[PDB]
């Protein structure tokens with residue numbers, strides 16, 4: 455079969471006027487470094503020795519990786535706001551990705567923060583902004599970007615295509631109903647885009663959704679979003695059910711409260727104690743702070759998602775998860791862990 459590799463990352467590239475003060479390095483410097491690390495991870499495979507009994511607790515390989523996956527095909531970034539930093543980032547990503555889209559609001563202020571990079575041609579693109587009537591006080595726009603990509607051809611001259619969507623949802627922790635309204639719209643727009651670009655014959659290899667959803671799969675506060683119908687149609691490889699994580703799933707928001715290299719963070723996040731200290735956990739309501747280490751449960755708030763549809767694909771092909779990874783390659787450069795997924799598309 456053919457393998458396709460996706461990654462999502464919130465890279466926190468704000469304008470210097472709004473970013474943390476008293477920094478020796480600006481947003482442009484971090485952006486260049488993020489772009490170089492992504493390129494270097496994607497371009498160079500890590501040593502892969504033979505494994506005789508691979509992933510015995512799951513249907514696919516899963517890990518906390520110090521690198522972006524080699525042979526990455528599609529990259530969805532959020533919070534790419536600073537234009538000069540976005541330029542540095544594009545210059546660096548260009549060494550690996552042939553098709554880069556930024557300023558995506560034009561396909562709907564250019565303040566979505568979304569960037570998409572692809573090794574495969576982009577056939578169609580749509581951007582939709584989530585409604586936010588706020589007396590014109592929003593500094594950024596939250597929204598969803600929809601892509602259709604050309605990924606090959608069959609021996610019968612049928613075009614092989616794939617669908618990708620990336621989004622950044624409403625952030626305030628108490629605003630559960632607003633995120634459910636946004637997920638309702640994301641569901642509607644995914645179907646609208648599929649219909650508008652469906653109209654050579656085409657075979658669908660995959661249909662992926664990713665992004666910074668700003669809700670976890672472990673706290674009672676996010677219970678309504680966890681139960682949303684989107685998860686019925688777009689499968690979350692880290693989930694056993696609403697509010698129930700698989701044992702190997704970890705949080706993706708770092709606790710922002712010192713040289714920590716990708717290898718160091720990897721080792722830290724492979725331990726329960728390191729996760730309790732480095733990752734965000736649901737805040738205790740009586741103190742308004744992260745609960746004492748010994749009382750924390752699970753592996754942290756996972757708010758960055760990487761999902762795949764099982765329905766709607768070519769009936770003759772099995773598109774399944776091959777690998778799922780939480781990435782530490784941007785340690786010190788952003789407050790989220792990038793998430794990646796490889797899908798193996800096979801016949802027979």
Ligand SMILES: [Ca+2]
Nearest residue numbers: 464466533789
């Ligand atoms: Ca942020």
